[PDB]
Amino acid sequence: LTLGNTTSSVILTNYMDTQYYGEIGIGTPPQTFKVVFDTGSSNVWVPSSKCSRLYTACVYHKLFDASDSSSYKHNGTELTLRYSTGTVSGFLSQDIITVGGITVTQMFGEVTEMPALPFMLAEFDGVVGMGFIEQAIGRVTPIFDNIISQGVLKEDVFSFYYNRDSSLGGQIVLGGSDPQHYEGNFHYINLIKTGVWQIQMKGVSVGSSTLLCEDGCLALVDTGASYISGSTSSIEKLMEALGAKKRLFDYVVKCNEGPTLPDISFHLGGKEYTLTSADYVFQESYSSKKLCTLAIHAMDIPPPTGPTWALGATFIRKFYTEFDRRNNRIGFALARH
Ligand SMILES: Cc1cc(Cl)c(OCCOc2ccc(C3=C(C(=O)N(Cc4cccc(C)c4C)C4CC4)[C@H]4CNC[C@@H](C3)N4)cc2)c(Cl)c1
Ligand SMILES: *[C@@H]1O[C@H](CO)[C@@H](O)[C@H](O)[C@H]1NC(C)=O
Ligand SMILES: *[C@H]1O[C@H](CO)[C@@H](O)[C@H](O)[C@H]1NC(C)=O
């Protein structure tokens, strides 16, 4: 029973400003997993005990042991995800998942097949998709949908705070926002359509001049992405405008110049969201002989979602983000650290 004022929160660990994860329990008694909570996908994945020790990504992560949960219920429906370095596959199962003290009976994918890269470099063990049912593999009801159907949470919204690496690493609130991690007020932008946390963008400004995305473009708000990302060509333009020169997959500046780079502005719902140099350069060193990388990368996202920009941890660290299902909209407020 609720009296209409209940929320719950999940505390996150920050790994290298690139991976932000919380812990959830699966089964009875609970088996614990480190998971990334990801607004750009809608399925729950964890590695299965039936994953072969010939898969290097399985060898060094927590595996889910179905035989040890009294509440597990067999399903077996094969599941497939194309990933750009190979195919990940596994089977469907059902059990009880515990998140922020809430218990939910949930379908999830047990992974039995995984490329070694990039998955062996994950600090976390799995993924909890916070996207819409419309994009769920095998159309299974996502975890937040199940949570809502309980009618326990104050509002049909969840929010994300991501800290700079140092101190709380981040926090997800289910059913509200935490006024301690943001300042001032929320502005909201409506979603282009239901089924994806994607909004319209009206311009990207270096300095005081709109250098990109006039005539508009799309922005995916992806809590699971490490960086702000754009199309190859867009990023070329932005980088050649910054003095940044291409390494292998990175763009680099001289660590002494970094602190004098220009602001980048994102124009979203008639408000300008500005990142300064301190927000987008990894300043490992303030030295004239060293090379510093930028938290902005190139990426070309396939249809139907793309071509699109993606506003990942780099953008979220600056702006506390509220994801509003009741009104199909996203709100931003300046985060406080
Ligand atoms: C160790 C391990 C790692 C993972 Cl990702 C896992 O889940 C298997 C499901 O596969 C994926 C699920 C989601 C994603 C997504 C994303 C994605 O790239 N992810 C993987 C990721 C992110 C950062 C750093 C590393 C090393 C990795 C592996 C997962 C969200 C964390 C991003 C970017 N693209 C769109 C969405 C979806 N958001 C990519 C792969 C399992 Cl079962 C085990
Ligand atoms: C909801 O609970 C919070 C607990 O911090 C309390 O401060 C607030 O007054 C409550 N609001 C309502 C609607 O009663
Ligand atoms: C799980 O698989 C069962 C067979 O055991 C299938 O009939 C069912 O649709 C699956 N659950 C869902 C809701 O996808």
Side-chain angles (χ1 to χ4, degrees):
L1 307 168
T2 180
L3 283 210
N5 197 24
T6 306
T7 57
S8 86
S9 72
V10 184
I11 297 303
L12 310 177
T13 292
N14 176 352
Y15 174 79
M16 323 227 340
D17 276 347
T18 61
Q19 306 168 42
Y20 288 81
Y21 52 89
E23 290 189 299
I24 58 164
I26 312 189
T28 320
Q31 298 174 44
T32 300
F33 297 75
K34 295 174 198 180
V35 287
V36 167
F37 295 88
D38 178 63
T39 57
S41 74
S42 310
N43 290 80
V44 179
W45 300 95
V46 296
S48 183
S49 62
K50 297 158 193 189
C51 189
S52 146
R53 203 156 203 83
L54 256 129
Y55 284 94
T56 319
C58 288
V59 181
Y60 305 119
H61 286 106
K62 194 84 154 83
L63 310 188
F64 178 68
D65 196 359
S67 72
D68 298 323
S69 168
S70 66
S71 55
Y72 165 79
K73 293 191 190 157
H74 174 274
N75 193 286
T77 317
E78 318 319 353
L79 291 156
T80 280
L81 174 54
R82 76 251 42 97
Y83 187 83
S84 79
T85 61
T87 179
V88 32
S89 46
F91 59 94
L92 223 127
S93 312
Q94 168 185 283
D95 215 321
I96 290 172
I97 298 177
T98 313
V99 222
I102 292 158
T103 64
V104 202
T105 305
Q106 178 67 40
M107 311 277 191
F108 63 92
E110 283 190 75
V111 166
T112 55
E113 231 104 350
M114 206 153 90
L117 265 274
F119 299 97
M120 81 176 307
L121 320 167
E123 250 294 324
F124 54 91
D125 296 299
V127 182
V128 170
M130 305 294 280
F132 295 78
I133 188 155
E134 290 93 322
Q135 280 190 164
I137 297 201
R139 278 279 296 219
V140 321
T141 312
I143 199 152
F144 192 72
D145 302 71
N146 288 320
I147 293 177
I148 289 301
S149 76
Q150 296 190 189
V152 279
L153 299 183
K154 173 164 203 188
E155 293 288 5
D156 190 8
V157 321
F158 58 83
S159 24
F160 278 65
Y161 167 66
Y162 275 1
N163 208 175
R164 314 204 295 139
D165 199 4
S166 177
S167 181
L168 177 70
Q171 176 203 54
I172 298 175
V173 186
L174 311 175
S177 284
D178 182 353
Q180 303 299 309
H181 303 306
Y182 68 86
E183 61 187 67
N185 298 292
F186 279 107
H187 176 82
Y188 301 83
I189 311 87
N190 295 136
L191 300 168
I192 293 170
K193 50 220 191 65
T194 355
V196 49
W197 294 111
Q198 190 177 209
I199 55 170
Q200 183 77 15
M201 181 153 62
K202 309 95 78 74
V204 193
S205 292
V206 187
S208 303
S209 69
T210 315
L211 301 198
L212 268 127
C213 190
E214 65 289 297
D215 274 297
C217 61
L218 316 176
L220 184 67
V221 187
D222 189 355
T223 58
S226 298
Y227 312 113
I228 289 168
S229 92
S231 74
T232 310
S233 26
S234 314
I235 298 314
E236 292 181 25
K237 279 220 75 208
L238 176 74
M239 292 297 172
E240 196 190 16
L242 289 168
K245 312 224 91 180
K246 160 141 272 301
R247 204 193 254 164
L248 276 319
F249 303 94
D250 317 287
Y251 278 90
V252 300
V253 290
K254 293 161 52 206
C255 293
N256 64 300
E257 286 167 299
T260 56
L261 261 52
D263 291 10
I264 294 160
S265 278
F266 298 90
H267 194 216
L268 306 157
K271 179 169 149 214
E272 295 276 6
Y273 297 87
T274 314
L275 298 220
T276 72
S277 68
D279 316 296
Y280 73 92
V281 187
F282 294 117
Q283 291 278 350
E284 223 77 295
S285 145
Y286 271 55
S287 165
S288 26
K289 321 83 197 179
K290 286 218 180 67
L291 298 173
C292 284
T293 75
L294 324 172
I296 311 171
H297 283 64
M299 187 146 303
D300 296 304
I301 298 136
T305 318
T308 188
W309 291 66
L311 300 183
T314 308
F315 188 90
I316 295 149
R317 278 192 286 278
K318 197 164 182 86
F319 303 112
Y320 191 98
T321 300
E322 178 179 284
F323 298 89
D324 179 349
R325 280 291 293 278
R326 169 68 214 261
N327 298 133
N328 281 299
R329 66 186 191 160
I330 298 167
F332 298 115
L334 190 67
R336 27 209 208 79
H337 302 101

